[PDB]
């Protein structure tokens, strides 16, 4: 009889668990199984963290699982993030994400054995870099909030611009929860640079649209480059018609992420059980203080996975454990509607037959981004000189 191997997963509704159990049954059929037998075991996102931890130590860890999946808590608000859940496996050394858009998981210290197959908000900045090559930009302004996503996007944008090419001008920070932000628009307007790149949440982007709207700053020359949290929800009616936006392909109902997830994990199990040793996880969380000897090795097998003929496209992991070749779609607000004006496969940006409309009523992007006069010259106090 083949060895019974269990696979842990954290899903939301029951339909996703049905697609998971079906994907495991297909994984035990399309793959040659001569000594192992995959088992489907998934739970639901509990509203409390203690009951969730007990559900893992009494549903997932008690079944001796090797790989654990995670998605997103089905809640309209955000108060109890599942990040501490990722610490649970940290006590037993691998969890794969599905819709985790927060870049906090990109760190290696607090998230050692953790990998995800979804491009966060930082990868979108890479696409923004392509924008800097689409119309030849140089001076850009990054306006982010004062938290971890702003620092991560700042270090990522600074890391991408480390050669002798363009650089960053003045990065503005603000506390998430302050509406009176007129000084940011005054200091941002006084600066010669006009390329505005906003990367915040909804309530902040609404204040940027209101404060920036009551000062007449949406005319010609002003460019607004946002992501996805600025053109969805209540921040859509306040955004100007012609703002450059983004849209992730297959945001809701990601059955391909579950099927390809069980495919990659199944390949890592069938391929992992062909070398030596291969220890077994402990039974439950009752008197198990020792760590797992097969942790970084399992993460190495999960990272070295290639699927050029996959459903989503080309599954490939980088050196940090993210999702390479992201598939986005450059959108543009036209007549109170989101009209598709571009697509991003992963390597370059492909444009369709729709012309990009600028919020300042312009249709063609000029060569020079901004030029004028009025030079400020300061000097010290010296008797023989000045």
């Amino acid at each position: 009889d083949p060895k019974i191997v269990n696979i842990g997963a954290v899903l939301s509704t029951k339909k996703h668990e049905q697609i998971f159990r079906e994907a495991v049954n297909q994984a035990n059929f399309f793959h040659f199984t001569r000594k192992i037998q995959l088992n489907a075991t998934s739970v639901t996102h509990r509203p409390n963290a203690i009951q969730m931890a007990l559900s893992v130590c009494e549903d997932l860890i008690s079944s001796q699982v090797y790989a654990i999946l995670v998605s997103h808590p089905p809640a309209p608000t955000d108060h109890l993030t599942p990040t501490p859940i990722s610490y649970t496996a940290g006590f037993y050394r691998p969890v794969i994400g599905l819709t985790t858009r927060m870049s906090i998981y990109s760190d290696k210290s607090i998230h050692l054995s953790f990998l995800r197959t979804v491009p966060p908000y930082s990868h979108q900045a890479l696409v923004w870099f392509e924008m800097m090559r689409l119309f030849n930009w140089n001076h850009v302004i990054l306006i982010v909030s004062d938290d971890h996503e702003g620092r991560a996007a700042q270090k990522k944008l600074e890391t991408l611009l480390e050669e002798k090419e363009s650089k960053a001008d003045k990065v503005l920070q603000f506390e998430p929860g302050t509406k009176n932000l007129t000084a940011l628009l005054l200091e941002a307007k006084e600066l010669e640079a006009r390329v505005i790149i906003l990367s915040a949440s909804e309530d902040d982007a609404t204040a940027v649209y209101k404060s920036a709207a009551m000062l007449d700053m949406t005319g010609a020359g002003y460019v607004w480059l946002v992501g996805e949290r600025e053109i969805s929800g209540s921040a859509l009616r306040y955004a100007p018609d012609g703002i450059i936006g983004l849209q992730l392909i297959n945001g809701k109902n990601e059955s391909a992420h579950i099927s390809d997830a069980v495919a990659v994990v199944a390949q890592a199990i069938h391929e992992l059980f062909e070398m030596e040793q291969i220890t077994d996880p402990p039974r439950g969380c009752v008197g198990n203080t020792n760590i797992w000897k097969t942790g970084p090795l399992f993460k190495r097998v999960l990272m070295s996975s290639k699927y050029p003929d996959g459903v989503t496209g080309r599954i490939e992991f980088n050196e940090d454990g993210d999702r390479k070749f992201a598939q986005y779609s450059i959108m543009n607000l036209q007549n109170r509607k989101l009209v598709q004006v571009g697509i991003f496969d992963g390597s370059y940006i492909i444009q369709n037959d729709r012309k990009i409309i600028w919020p300042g009523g312009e249709t063609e992007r000029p060569q020079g981004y901004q030029m004028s006069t009025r030079l400020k010259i300061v000097t010290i106090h010296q008797e023989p000189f000045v």
Partner: protein, 459 residues
């Protein structure tokens, strides 16, 4: 009111001689009356910890959780922080895995430990390395959550003083993969400094010292210095640790376990009584386990302001804004031959006292020992003796810290004062140029009585 204060004890130590405390009943001058409830625990799994916290919380309405163990795992301590995410209870660290610091924590968490952070301990280590004239040093850090402020604290500290320090290179080692591709040895072979600061955990220090023990890393010229989170418990000593490991701690030998628990109960009860004595309005007690959406509004952060400046028995037993003690009474211990942590220094908030140990640092181990005493006289042009500045207390660059043994002639009674100054001149220059070439350790001091040799009667 009688507030419940539970003390969690993890380990094989008999709690019968520990729970018996006589510092109650008569020591209840405050209007609030606490009660001690100590529990035991054998295993060190998170399921039993969360189980005893939830069952003990729903069973007894406790207010101050004092967790104390004896293992050497920091991740479990992080789990304690997770408990705060579900409780926001001022958890105090006394000894064990909960005695390790963790920089950059949650602004809403209430994780407080008696041990100081890396800013104070780093300053103590730099003071020890400054008194013994240890300029060239090395830094070995790993992937521990809290190294950016460590390296930036060391650099930002050495860039301020006028002493001619020297920094070789701050390397980094990985522990997820074993040393099988020949990289850790290649990173450690470039360290030729006499003093090396280690910043990692215990299970990582066993492997770093395991490889360094094979690759000529232990004897003289490669002295390793670890803070308090590396050694942890002074009763668990393996074998791979070499002789001569400078460590620091807090009280430990002075204040035992019942003293630390009593001080923790005094801090929790005092801080819980200042709001009732000043604001005259306190909320309810803690709720059960999953009932957090209803009691999440009753939590008040004002008590945090009462967890920074705390006084007790006159001594400055307070904390800071980062969640650690501001002015600790640290104790410096050094490993000897029989593998036992013996006290060698006493650091009081500021001043450092070296009374249990003499002036000489090493003793006898393989390699050569002793040194060479050098005495001179303040001869201008050649030997220029200058007093040490009171705003520093340490000589800089080639100025040799030349001591001075004087005796206070108090009427008909003499004493023994040692005033240290800074000597510099031609003799210091030539003796240091030839001393650097021939490579040996020496000493320098002056003469206080007898001056130049002469004839007395017939001798």
């Amino acid at each position: 009111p009688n507030m419940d204060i539970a003390v969690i004890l993890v380990g094989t130590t008999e709690e019968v001689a520990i729970k018996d405390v006589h510092e109650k009943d008569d020591f209840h001058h405050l209007p609030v009356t606490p009660r001690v409830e100590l529990v035991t625990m054998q295993e060190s799994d998170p399921k039993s910890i969360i189980t005893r916290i939830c069952d003990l919380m729903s069973d007894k309405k406790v207010q101050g959780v004092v967790f104390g163990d004896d293992t050497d795992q920091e991740a479990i301590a992080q789990i304690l922080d997770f408990i705060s995410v579900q409780t926001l209870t001022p958890i105090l660290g006394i000894h064990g895995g909960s005695s390790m610091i963790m920089a950059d924590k949650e602004e809403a968490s209430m994780f407080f430990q008696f041990g100081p952070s890396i800013e104070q301990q780093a300053s103590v280590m730099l003071n020890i390395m400054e008194e013994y004239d240890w300029y060239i040093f090395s830094i070995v850090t790993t992937y521990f959550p809290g190294y950016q402020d460590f390296e930036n604290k060391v650099r930002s500290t050495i860039e301020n003083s006028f002493v001619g320090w020297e920094l070789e290179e701050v390397i980094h080692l990985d522990m997820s993969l074993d040393d099988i591709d020949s990289k850790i040895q290649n990173q450690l072979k470039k360290l030729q400094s006499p003093v090396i600061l280690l910043y990692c955990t215990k299970e990582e220090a066993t492997y770093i010292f395991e490889v360094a023990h094979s690759v000529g890393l232990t004897g003289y010229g490669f002295t390793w210095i670890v803070p308090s989170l590396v050694a942890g418990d002074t009763d668990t000593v393996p074998d791979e640790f070499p002789t001569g490991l400078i460590s620091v701690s807090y009280d430990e030998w002075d204040y035992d376990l019942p003293a630390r628990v009593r001080d923790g109960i005094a801090i929790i009860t005092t801080a819980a009584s200042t709001m009732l004595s000043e604001h005259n309005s306190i909320p309810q007690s803690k709720s059960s386990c999953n009932n957090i959406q209803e009691s999440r509004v009753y939590e008040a952060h004002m008590l945090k302001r009462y967890l920074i400046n705390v006084t007790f028995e006159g001594r400055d037993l307070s904390f800071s804004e980062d969640g650690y003690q501001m002015h600790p009474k640290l104790v410096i211990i050094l490993l000897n031959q029989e593998r036992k942590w013996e006290r060698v220094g006493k650091y009081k908030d500021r001043s450092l006292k070296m009374w249990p140990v003499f002036d000489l640092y090493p003793n006898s181990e393989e390699h050569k020992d002793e040194h060479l005493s050098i005495v001179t006289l303040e001869e201008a042009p050649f030997v220029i003796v200058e007093d040490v500045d009171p705003l520093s207390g340490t000589c800089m660059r080639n100025t040799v810290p030349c001591r001075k043994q004087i005796r206070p002639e108090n009427r008909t009674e003499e004493g023994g004062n040692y005033i240290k100054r800074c000597c510099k001149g031609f003799c210091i220059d030539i003796l240091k140029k030839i001393a650097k070439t021939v490579k040996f350790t020496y000493d320098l001091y002056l003469v206080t009585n007898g001056k130049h040799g002469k004839k007395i009667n017939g001798v």
